[PDB]
Every structure is written in C-alpha cells, then in structure tokens.
Symmetry: D2
Subunit: 232 residues, 4 copies
C-alpha cells in the first residue's frame, strides 16, 4: 500500500521522451491511469503505444487555451477529472536575445503552468485531494524557471487547506538523447560541475515526481525538490 | 563618497512614493536624473520637482517604440544612461485563484518583460563605457501582505531570476545588476488606515513600523554608487525583518 | 523492488518517540535492520520492544565520543557497518537572547550540531568503502536564536559534506519538519492549537509518519541522485 | 549629513589587517570613534597607530568571556557604550571530514560562531537602552575554494536572522556581509596560474578589494540602513 497511485488519473505534459516518458511510465507502474501528451497526433499515438492499458496519449499545445480545454474535456469524459498534473512540457544571449525568444519561453514554460494549473484546480478542490508537480529542467530560461518556483510557493499557500499540494522538481544534468550527442570533451567538462561525477537518469527524476505525487507526500507543498547530484 | 556626479540615471515610474524618493535622492547625490510617467502631465510633474537636476518624460514600458524614443531623447540631450532603475512594482493585490489570464499577462508584461526590454536597450552603451548600474525595484508589500501579492509572485521571482542570470553575463564589463525588495512601506493607502489597523498589519514586521520611501531610495543609491562595484546578482531586502 | 531497504543497516538516533520512532518503524517496515537509540538503558529496551526481530535498541549519548564508539562497534560486530544514518537526536533550550545563558547555547551546539559532525564522521569510512551510503539529518523548524543557529549550521554542514562524498556513492541530506503532532503539541490547550494552525496553510499539523516517509524516500536507492538537499515537510508554512 | 557616523562608537573585532583593517579605517573616516581588536598587545598597538585620534586598539580574545568583559568595560568607561559592533574575527581549520579532528571542529565553532553569540549579547543591553544599534557579522572570505567553516558560517547566518527578529522593535539591526574572493596577503602569495583559475569562478573577472567589504559594512552601519535587518549582503562579483 506504500506510494500506491491506484485509482488516480495523471496528466503528464510532454511525455514523448526522456524525463516526461520516464515519469509517465513510473506513474503507470505505480497504478495511475496516465494520459501523456505531445504536440502532434503521431506523438500522441507513440505515447498510447508505450502505455497500452495503463493509459493513452493525446495531442496538446500548452500555449493554446482551446487545446487545453479540449484535452481536459476528453480526459474528464473518458477517465474522470485529473488528480495528478505533471507540467513537464517546455523549451529553450542577452545583448542579442530577441523579443520572440523571450516571449515564447514565458508562454511555453511559465504561463502554461498557470493555465493548466488553473484548469485542473476546481476538480481537485472539489475532491479535496490533488497533486500538481512542475518539472523545471539562458537569461530567458532562468527568469521563467524562477517564476515557476515563485508561482509554486504562492499557489501552494492558497490551495493547501483544500488537500492539494503544489511542488517543483528541479533536475540537474540528466542523460538525454541531446546530452548523449555531445562529444566526450564536452561530457567531461559538464561532469566537472557535478560532485556525483555522473549524469542523472531520467528514471531518477521520475522517482522524485512519483514520491511527491503519492499520499505519503501530503504535507509537502510549496517545495522545490532538487535532483542534481550535488551540483548546486 | 557615494557621489554620482556626471552620471545619467533613468528612473522609471517616478511620479510618487518610492519612485519619486529614488529620483530625488539620486539627484541630491549629483546624478542627472530622468524620471518617467505614463502621461505627459505625469512627466511635467516630475520635471517640476527635479528642476535643474533633471527632467521628466512620458514612457510606456510595454511599448518598444516608446522605449526607443525615450532612450534616443535621453541620449541626444544627456548622453547614454549610466544608471537604470526599473520600477518593476506596479501591482494591485489579488489571489492566484481569482485572477484571470489578462491580469496575469499584464503583470508579466509590465513587471517582468519590461525589465528585459529596458535592460537590453541600455546595455550596449554601458558595456562600451565599461561602467553601468541596473537596479530593479520590486513592488511594495501592501495591507494584505504576501498573501495579497500572490498575483505578482511569479513576476517578482522572475525579475530576481533574470537579475542573477544577467548579472553573470555582464559583470566582466563593469555593469552590475541588482534587485531591491521593499517590505511594507508607508504609502498614501497606509496613511489612511486607523492606528488599530496599522498595528495589525505591523504584527508581521519585527521592526514594528513601516519603512519610509527614502529608505528604499538609500538602498538604491548605495547600489548605484562606485562603492558597490563588487555587488551584483544580489537581492537587497529592505523590510524591517519581515518573513 | 521499489524503495526497498532489504539488507541495509540503519541507525536512527533518538528513536524513543514521535518522529524518531516513526522513522525507525518505517525503515523496518521497508526491510532495513534498524538500530534505534535512547539516552538510557530502559529507553533502549523500549525501542527493542517495538522493533522486535527487525532490529534492536541501544543506549547512546551523542555528545560523548566513547558512547559513540562503543555503539558503533556493537553495531558493526553484530550487524555489519551502518548503511543509513538518521541523525534525529536533538533538544531545545528556548529563551530570549537577552536572558540566554552560556550553557543553553553550548548544550544546543553540542547536542544538535557537533553531534552531526561526530556521528557522520564515524560512519563515513564504512560507507565510502562500500561506495553506498545515506546520511539524513532531521532538523525541526521549531526565543530560539540558539536552536536557529544550530539548525542553519546542520544545513551548511550538509551541503558542504555532500560535496566531498558524493563521488563515492554517499548522499547527505536534511529533512526539515514544520509543526508536527507530538506529545508536546497534544498537551497544549485548544486556543493555543488554533493559534499555531493559523500559521499553517494546510490547516493541520503534520503526522510523524509524514516525516518518516520523507526520510525513507531519501534513504532509498531511488534517491541516489539527491544530495546536499533540504526537503521541507511543513504543509506550506514556509 | 549622508551615511555619517559622528558620535557613534564602533567596535571592530580582528582589525589588524585586510578586511578588518579596511572596515575600521572606513568607519573612522565616516566619523565613528573606533576600537579595533587583535589577539595580542602588539597587535592592539599597531591598530592604535593607524587610527590615531579616531580611536584605539585593544587586545581581545573572542573565545574568552573574561577578555570580552574587560574590553567592554574599558570601552564603556572611556568612550561610552558600543553603538556599532562588527564581528570580523575568525579562523579556518581545513580538512576532509573523514580526517577532521574534534579540536579543528570545535575551535571553529568557538571562534567563528559562539563568539558572535557572546559579543552580540554583551552589547545588546546598552544598544536597547539607547533604542539604536548595529551589529554586523562578516562571514569571511572564500580562499581559493573551505569545508570546516561552512557549518559555522551558515550558523552565523541563522543566528543573524533569528536574533534580528527579537531585537528589531528596539532599533537594533543585525546583518551579515558575505564576502566572495577578496584580495588578501594569502591571495597575493599564490602563483599567477592559480589566480587565473580562481578568477574563472568570478564573472566580474577580478578579486574584490577589502575596501569594498568596508563600504558594505559602513552602509549597513549607517542611519540610512535602519530598515534593513536579518539580511545577508553578498559582495562577491557574481560568484556562484
Ligand atoms: O525536452 P524534450 O524535447 O525531450 O521534451 C520536452 C517536451 O516539450 C514539448 N513541447 C515543446 N513545445 C511545446 C508546446 N508549445 N506545447 C506542448 N508541448 C511542447 C515536446 O513535445 P513534442 O515532442 O511534441 O515536441 C516534448 O515532449
Ligand atoms: O501608482 P503606481 O503603483 O502605478 O506607481 C508607480 C509608477 O509606475 C508607472 N507606470 C504604471 N504603468 C506603467 C507602464 N505601463 N509603463 C511605464 N510606467 C508605468 C506609473 O505612471 P503614472 O504615474 O503615469 O501611472 C507610476 O508613476
Ligand atoms: O522527543 P524529544 O524532542 O523530547 O527528544 C527527542 C530525542 O532526542 C534524544 N536525545 C536528547 N539528548 C540526547 C543525547 N545527548 N544523546 C542522544 N539522544 C538524545 C531523546 O532521547 P531519550 O528518548 O533518551 O530522551 C529523544 O529520543
Ligand atoms: O590575513 P587576512 O586573511 O586578511 O585576515 P585573518 O584571516 O588573519 O584575520 C583574522 C583576524 O581575526 C583575529 N582572530 C583570529 N582568531 C581570534 C580569536 N580567537 N579571538 C580574537 N581574534 C581572533 C586575528 O587577530 P590577530 O591579528 O591577533 O591574529 C585577525 O585580526
């Protein structure tokens, strides 16, 4: 019965690969009915393929209110409301950083948190039980990440008394298809920053998320959990 | 000592309270000061209190064209901006659960994206001179404390994230980038409360009084001075011990 | 096989009651062989009584090097080295600074901060030889300048030590409880309870088991990339 | 009248050289009557020599209650109570924890942390009587990084925040200044390749000057910082 998610419906945004995928898979293994999202239909189909009976994939654009609305309705109709929301969808030189780079980061990595969070909150508060977990893996990225943490603390305070927790997981350097493609000199350089002397695995971010999502983390909210091998 | 003679300062949102106190103190320390308001009459009132020590200009920090025009005018008349003080603290209280998306994005544009635009527009000049100061001032906390400013929390934290990150890119060229974070400061709204209400709001503040706008000004003037050249990426809290 | 502690030996200091006890019980339930401590022999016996075959209790004074040494030798001989150390023993000596006495300061430093240094150093060699270890310090957010100093110190020690030992497979973390239901809170009047809950957005006190869960998670194989971290369990209080 | 310290009595512990000295000098230049301390009498005499009329030096061991008491009495008798306390005295005792000795640990605790408790408490009463006071802890320099010290430094910061909350309502502020890599006699004695390597950690691309720590201290000590308390002011050229 320990950290068991039977009966819970989880929505994991941006679940095609790496961290997102590891999270979706672990939540399914712990008993959740899982809905993972991608930006395209084929993306959504690949997610359905790896979840099989434990859930399904859907197409979602987190910068589009209509897409958000349609996806939540479909989830609600087929599975019941979202109990666990994992906001993992996101994207990535100041003297030349352009207006569009800045605002795309704000919309995709920060405002998306606000929108999705607000769209699932009413159902969670009616049930008196809920989990929102933001995964926050460059001045534009930094501002948005810090904003997600500011939002997390502040919102946690408003919704705690209704049984909903709101937290952030902050990965360090994690082994991605992108990290694997770097050369060995670059790999060695990056690891010099990490006292543990290795990259993290996506499954290690998944574990942190699964823990916060469980009944046994009910008194943890407003928290940033760092998973970085000692890097900061 | 903490002398700003020969420096050109732009203080956004200098009509009243904190903004005004800052613009006045920077003028008293020798800076040529340009304060801004959203309207022309606003700009005129600023000109009126600065007299010889500077002038006021109309600026909308959400409008690139307004920004460009204002910086050109400053550059032509005074030379580039040496000190930029961003008022990044124009908000009214509200709960995250109550606020709608338009309130959210207006706060983001006015309080956070404005910092990015203004900062980027003054940086080239500062880096060419190998000397510069950018100081972001967060909003005052009002009657409803931190709970009341949940609407601003993401923006405020973002300004701090931007500050640390950008400080790192520009430090080697003699530009510092810092934030001042006021606590509960005396405003017209707080003056209007009764004494029982003041004490109640003050129960959060160990110092047992509200801060004066001049105290925020001092902190800003210190960071803006030559004697703070090794301070950057920092948030300086001026809050009488709250939290 | 998930968050399973089979084959691991855990030492939980100060396990007589509340948080300490919850931790020792949960670690046993997850498969660890657990040694819990108290300051007296009868304390140690009560701990043996609730662990039964999953471990035993021992008398330990964390301000006494000899006591530390004797306890570790006994653990090592009987069970093998310590794999998991939970530093939970601590005390309070509240008072206004203007009245605070030398002894109230130094007892807090010795019991709540230096003890972490001593116990941590005494288990580290074994853990580094195995390339696997967990050290978890439990620090309550609880006239407290002495307690505050010591707690901030434990956090500084944690971050700094984590950096030295990470590359040898040992993690070092802190769990920071907020207001938790203990014998002390149960004894307060209803007006005082309502006042303390006004500080907590979740609107209830935490359960000792909820601190135990956090500790058990960090102690598990699945938290191998988490180190130098403070995990706050406080219902939103900060 | 700006950041003026005329009429204030300042005690700066550990004022023989570097940061301590720069602080004592600056506070004197801003008008304070300054008492700087060293561990020996000749140390105290050198301090008297550089302060001349603006103050004097005294011998003090911050791990010895009797020494603390004697020094405070002498200050009080001759100058009046301490208005500004700068706790700068500290040491390092480096070592990996798996080899660090009990005495290294406890000497650091006593010298860098408990000393703050003792000196702070000893000046507080006079400060609260006047409804005006400043306590500033300087939590010293990183030196080509120093692991033993981290617990004590973090403790000083915890103590600072917690104490600030108790005494704020009586006009006393309590803050910390946290220097980064500062040019000292020890940094001067590194080779050039080592200096370059350290500076790679610092975005500003140079070491700080002791005077720059002094400025931060003098600001916090002034009337114009009356609403700043419980704060750590970092002076590190962007390092971290
Ligand atoms: O790191 P990774 O690229 O492995 O994953 C990040 C995720 O971000 C998603 N993503 C990027 N932009 C958007 C957007 N506007 N809306 C929804 N998802 C997005 C990606 O979906 P996708 O794989 O469909 O880009 C991807 O699954
Ligand atoms: O009382 P406020 O809290 O609005 O005062 C702070 C200042 O911010 C200024 N301000 C408000 N909105 C903007 C904007 N969009 N662009 C630039 N400055 C702004 C105000 O100008 P104004 O005084 O014209 O509102 C005012 O001087
Ligand atoms: O619940 P309480 O907060 O009252 O005490 C917590 C735990 O700390 C322990 N403790 C206190 N001082 C020491 C010490 N010097 N050495 C070891 N353990 C100690 C107590 O042991 P005990 O159970 O012996 O009081 C108890 O288990
Ligand atoms: O060289 P740089 O790196 O610039 O500076 P240091 O690291 O030498 O500065 C240390 C200062 O603190 C003082 N100090 C050290 N230990 C104690 C103690 N136990 N009691 C009182 N004062 C102490 C020293 O006095 P002293 O000058 O007597 O060593 C010195 O003035």
């Amino acid at each position: 019965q320990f950290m068991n998610l039977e009966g819970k419906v989880a929505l994991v945004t941006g679940a095609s690969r790496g961290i997102g995928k590891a999270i979706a898979e672990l939540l399914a293994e712990r008993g959740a009915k899982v809905i993972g999202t991608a930006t395209s239909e084929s993306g959504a189909q690949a997610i359905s393929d790896y979840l099989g009976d434990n859930g399904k994939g859907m197409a979602l654009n987190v910068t589009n209110p209509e897409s958000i609305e349609a996806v939540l309705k479909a989830i609600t109709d087929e599975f019941g409301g979202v109990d666990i929301l994992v906001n993992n969808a996101g994207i990535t030189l100041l003297m030349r950083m352009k207006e569009e780079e800045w605002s795309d980061i704000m919309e995709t990595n920060l405002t998306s948190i606000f929108r999705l969070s607000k769209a699932v909150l009413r159902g969670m508060m009616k049930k008196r039980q809920g989990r929102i977990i933001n995964v926050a893996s460059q001045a534009n990225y930094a501002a948005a990440k810090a904003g997600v943490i500011g939002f997390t603390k502040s919102m946690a305070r408003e919704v705690a008394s209704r049984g909903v927790t709101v937290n952030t997981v902050a990965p360090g350097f994690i082994e991605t298809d992108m990290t694997k493609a770097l050369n060995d000199e670059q790999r060695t350089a990056t690891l010099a920053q990490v006292p543990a002397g290795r990259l993290g695995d996506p499954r290690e971010i998944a574990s942190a998320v699964a823990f916060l999502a469980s009944p046994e983390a009910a008194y943890i909210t407003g928290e940033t959990l760092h998973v970085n091998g000692g890097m900061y």
